[PDB]
Design a protein around this ligand. Structure first.
Ligand code: HEM
Length: 411
């Protein structure tokens, strides 16, 4: 049993390691080369032990072997023992606050996933070009309305993807502060009874939204969810609400982070800014690299179903494991100069969307949201730059930017 070095075991679980970023990257360089599958054990037992998987190859094999590496038995995100208890008191014994797609395994998982799979294809999403473009123009309206200076997060990256996800879920605009509470507080990085209450309110709320989409079906994803048939029957209100909830929470901060990372890289490299300004076909490479370079979803966990080996390391039945995508996406085995923001890297070769049977349902939509936003930005600004220091959020699960002060000149 290889052990992670003590300092690294402390760092990998610390939200501030992700805000800081660089030192953690260095610790992954040293760890991944010596022991890409290594045990993290807390000296005073504040969390259950887990295997840190730190190489691209480890995360890739772990991700693809969904029969061996399960999402349901244990919390799907790293948590300290206290958070796990809190979750179980809130739900009456499950570690999953809400139990949605990402927390399920076969046979239930693929049945529910398959429901929206067609809707999430590029083909179908291309029908939302206009609706997204309208929300991007609204985002850039706010940017330019602020003057020649302001916080890119507050103005553009934070609200925009949430507006897009409200639009595809049929959430009315006046319910925006409820959705933000949902993605910023309920999820995001006797209080048990208020969270239990709030969960139940969201479920009742989404059950009603789904009722309306059964009466008045539309082209959006809420309609697909609401009208689903599983095993000859409709989905329960719990599952139906679970589907709305995951779409919104998987869809928001993640796309905020990569949108932000893309604007950051454009702001810091004005020669690249000018080239994509003149040739928008450069945009897909930039989008893809912003997702890799930011790695908005920083880890997911798994539980081993059975005794197995990963990278020749023995893993015992019921072992908890962290698939660390930050570590995976900065592996020099796959990425030359892993640190550099490089838009010339090829598509569909990073692990920011994971791989295997849970691979991100929304990855085409995410990419599309970013491409559209950036196209709009590029038409409407002649010049962009940083006006202060970019700050990362301190969180272990979904990361991103707290603050992104910039300065620009309106085209
Ligand atoms: C840059 C933006 C995004 C990133 C980095 C990202 C990342 C991920 C990752 C790593 C997973 C788990 C994959 C695995 O376990 O192998 C996932 C799952 C998922 N994502 Fe995305 N995501 C993003 C955007 C979105 C968007 C915009 C939506 C929809 C609006 C979405 C919907 C989902 C859903 C429903 C799942 C669960 C899939 C399943 O369990 O089968 N995601 N995402």
């Amino acid at each position: 049993i290889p052990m992670v070095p003590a300092e690294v075991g402390r760092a990998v679980i610390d939200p501030k390691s992700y805000g800081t970023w660089e030192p953690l990257l260095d610790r992954f360089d040293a760890l991944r080369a010596e022991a890409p599958v290594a045990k993290v054990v807390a000296p005073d037992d504040e969390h259950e032990p887990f295997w840190l998987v730190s190489s691209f190859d480890g995360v890739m094999k772990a991700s693809k072997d969904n029969a061996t590496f399960l999402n349901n038995p244990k919390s799907t995100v790293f948590t300290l023992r206290v958070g796990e208890m809190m979750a179980k008191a809130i739900t009456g014994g499950s570690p999953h606050l809400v139990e949605s797609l990402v927390q399920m395994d076969a046979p239930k998982h693929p049945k529910l996933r398959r429901l929206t799979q067609d809707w999430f294809m590029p083909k179908n999403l291309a029908r939302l070009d206009g609706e997204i473009r309208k929300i991007a123009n609204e985002a850039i309206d706010r940017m330019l309305g602020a003057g020649e200076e302001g916080d890119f997060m507050a103005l553009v990256a934070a609200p925009y993807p949430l507006h897009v996800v409200m639009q595809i879920l049929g959430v009315p605009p006046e319910d925006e502060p409820k959705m933000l509470f949902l993605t910023q507080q309920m999820f995001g990085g006797q209080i048990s009874q208020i969270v239990a209450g709030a969960v139940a309110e969201f479920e009742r709320y989404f059950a009603g939204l789904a009722a309306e989409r059964r009466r008045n079906p539309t082209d959006d994803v809420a309609t697909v969810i609401a009208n689903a048939v599983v095993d000859g029957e409709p989905m329960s209100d719990r599952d139906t609400a679970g589907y709305y909830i995951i779409t919104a929470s998987a869809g928001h901060d993640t796309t905020s982070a990569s949108s932000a990372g893309a604007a950051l890289a454009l702001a810091r490299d004005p020669d690249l800014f000018a080239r994509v300004k003149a040739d928008r076909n450069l945009l897909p490479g930039i989008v893809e690299e912003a997702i890799r370079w930011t790695t908005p979803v920083q880890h997911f966990m798994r539980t081993a179903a059975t005794d197995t080996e990963l990278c020749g390391q023995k893993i015992a039945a019921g072992d908890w494991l962290m698939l660390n995508y930050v570590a995976a996406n900065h592996d020099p085995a796959q990425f030359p100069e892993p640190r550099k923001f490089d838009p010339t890297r090829p598509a569909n070769r990073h692990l920011a969307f994971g791989a295997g049977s849970h691979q991100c349902l929304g990855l085409h939509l995410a990419r599309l949201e970013m491409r559209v936003l950036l196209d709009v930005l590029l038409d409407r600004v002649d010049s962009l730059e940083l006006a202060g220091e970019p700050k990362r959020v301190n969180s272990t699960f979904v990361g991103g930017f707290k603050s992104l002060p910039m300065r620009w000149k309106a085209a």
